[PDB]
Design a protein around this ligand. Structure first.
Ligand SMILES: C[C@@H]1CNc2nc(N)[nH]c(=O)c2N1
Ligand SMILES: C[C@@H]1CNc2nc(N)[nH]c(=O)c2N1
Lengths: 265, 265
């Protein structure tokens, strides 16, 4: 099915062999590139490498921050993890300068929650270093004529921007952006119609880990969402996703792997 | 989609509203209707009722037993649980006399792992008390020309037997019999083609809890199979199953419920 491998410089990721697990690195800052924060992050990456993660996702601005600062927090982390853990690292920013530094510092993949729309210059950063980029569906509003048709239109506007800036098709990964610009019911509608994004011809990453719509269904707080995340990973894999972005790496790797065996991937 | 409810005398089970969870009652015998065994079983049913189970499944001969004896072990259990826990009880036997007693003692549903083939008289027991019966795929051999086509043929031979004995269509539930008469690869093939059984027009129950094929994929012992069972429950629900038979009632209820929300059931 994929006629190419994901080229990540040093590392290569095969897209046919298994669902690829992206481990979410919790970047809990010190009040002050300090030791407790860089060391707590290195140990966390190591735990996830050992639990079956294939990519470590490192973020500077967690939604729940000055550009100069985001770099000083995230660059030390990427240096320590890329040196100490043999996994590709994706950098979770939408800012072009942050992306630029992160890749100099050793990150392999760009992870852009605004799909090259917040700062179009980021795809030029991608085009240049020639790295894979994740384009996530997002918009600053929630008025959908047709949810899926709109997601697909919007994603396609990211691809144009990326392709225009010089991004090769083989470095494009898409993401339905679950939990962004979507009501809880829209989130479950995007889950139920995820296979639609396959028509765009690109690999899909799904990020549903512990998100608020799981809580809305199950009526359960963020720490009781492991079964609900599992269900979303399972439906995602069955609908064709190539990657899942999760906190619970041990549990999701096992669910991923059993899905893979059953659907014949 | 289902134009009728599952009639269980005292209780009624709706087939459209949610995936219905069947809790597996571990019937750990005393060396001797004793207290520790009937009381350990009542507390276990109660825990599962509280964790979200809709049916309690009670078995006399766990595969890993004289007819007269199977009754003396299982009849006290059904009396205590049906009196003390307000859930329908299914009786996991293939023996007609055991089924007969179990229903006198208070069980609602017959659960027959040999699909009325080991003892055809059991469907007459079903026909008479007018109870729902689960017909599970099983055979005393593993030489399949075409796995799915054979399962469907074999299941259909159970339906004939049941219908001939007087069983109403509305009291027939089918079960692909995962882990019986199937190699590990055949088990994963039946999972991947489960939606095929829907053409027979009946509700489907799936039993994959902690089974040996999960262990074969994940390489993990029976107590580390919770993620692997989850994956099977998720794929089952997406492929259309009306019931899942599980040990981990808390975890599987949550995964069931999140699947239901997403697939729109
Ligand atoms: C809340 C987080 C932020 N970063 C993400 N990145 C991708 N690709 N996909 C996602 O779902 C998310 N969600
Ligand atoms: C091992 C157990 C025995 N009883 C079962 N009954 C049904 N219906 N389905 C099943 O899968 C099983 N498996």
């Amino acid at each position: 099915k994929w006629d190419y491998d994901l080229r990540c410089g040093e590392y290569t990721l095969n897209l046919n062999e298994k669902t690829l697990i992206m481990g979410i690195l919790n970047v809990t800052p010190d009040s002050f590139g300090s030791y407790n924060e860089v060391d707590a992050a290195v140990r966390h990456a190591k735990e996830m490498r050992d639990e079956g993660a294939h990519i470590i996702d490192i973020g500077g601005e967690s939604t729940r921050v000055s550009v100069e600062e985001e770099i000083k927090r995230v660059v030390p982390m990427i240096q320590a993890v890329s040196k100490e853990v043999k996994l590709p690292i994706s950098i979770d920013t939408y800012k072009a300068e942050v992306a630029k530094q992160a890749i100099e510092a050793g990150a392999h993949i760009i992870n852009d929650i605004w799909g090259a729309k917040a700062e179009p210059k980021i795809a030029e950063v991608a085009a240049h270093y020639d790295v894979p980029i994740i384009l996530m569906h997002n918009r600053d509003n929630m008025n959908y004529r047709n949810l899926m048709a709109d997601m697909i239109a919007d994603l396609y506007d990211s691809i144009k921007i990326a392709k225009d800036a010089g991004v090769r098709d083989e470095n494009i990964i898409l993401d339905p952006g679950i939990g962004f610009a979507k009501t809880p019911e829209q989130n479950l509608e995007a889950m139920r119609n995820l296979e639609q994004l396959n028509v765009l011809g690109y690999p899909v990453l799904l990020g549903t880990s512990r998100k608020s719509f799981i809580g809305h269904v199950l009526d359960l707080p963020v720490e009781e969402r492991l079964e609900g995340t599992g269900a979303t990973v399972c439906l995602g894999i069955e609908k064709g996703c190539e990657f899942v972005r999760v906190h619970d790496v041990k549990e999701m790797s096992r669910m991923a792997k059993m899905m893979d065996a059953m659907i014949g991937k």
